[PDB]
Amino acid sequence: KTIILEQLRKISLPLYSILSALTILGMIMASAFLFFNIKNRNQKLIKMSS
Amino acid sequence: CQFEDLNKRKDTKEIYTHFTCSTDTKNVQFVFDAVTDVIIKNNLKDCGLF
């Protein structure tokens, strides 16, 4: 009765790491946008757009 | 320029200048559009968008 395992069909770890790197890069870019928007909240051009 | 230099609130109050004559149609259209734009500028100031 050869032993029967039960392995999970796992998500690759390098793929997860690459996509997490890309999404944290996107998140820090979004944060930089939030900063450069909230620092220049007084120039009229940025003030016409809520 | 001599009239504009009488404004002590140059950075706050806008002064409009129009040169008129007895034979024109822009004399009456100017003020029609000018005050419409003033009203829009005022309501944009009130909301703080500008």
Topology at a glance:
This is part of a larger assembly, with chains A (50 residues) and B (50 residues).
Chain A: H1 13-39, H2 44-48
Chain B: H1 26-47
Provide tags for this entry.
part of a larger assembly, 2 chains, A: 50 residues, mainly alpha, 2 helices, B: 50 residues, Guanine nucleotide-binding protein G(i) subunit alpha-1 (chain B)
Description:
Chain A has 2 helices and no strands. With 50 residues, chain A is mainly alpha-helical. The N and C termini of chain A lie far apart (70 Å). Chain B is an all-alpha fold.
Total number of helices of chain B: 1
> In what range is the share of β-strand residues of chain A?
under 5%
Distance separating the two termini of chain A: 70 Å
Q: What pattern of helices and strands is seen along the backbone of chain A? A: HH
Structural class by secondary-structure content of chain B: mainly alpha
Number of helices of chain A: 2
- The general outline of chain A is rod-shaped
- Note the overall shape of chain B: flat
Oligomeric grouping of the chains: part of a larger assembly
Order of helices and strands of chain B: H
Largest sheet of chain A: none
Radius of gyration of chain B: 14 Å
Q: Please bin the fraction of helical residues of chain B.
A: 40-55%
Major sheet of chain B, described briefly? none
- Kindly report how far apart the N and C termini of chain B lie: 26 Å
PDB class: membrane protein
Keywords: Gi, membrane protein
Entry title: Cryo-EM structure of human GABA(B) receptor-Gi protein complex
Chain A: Gamma-aminobutyric acid type B receptor subunit 2
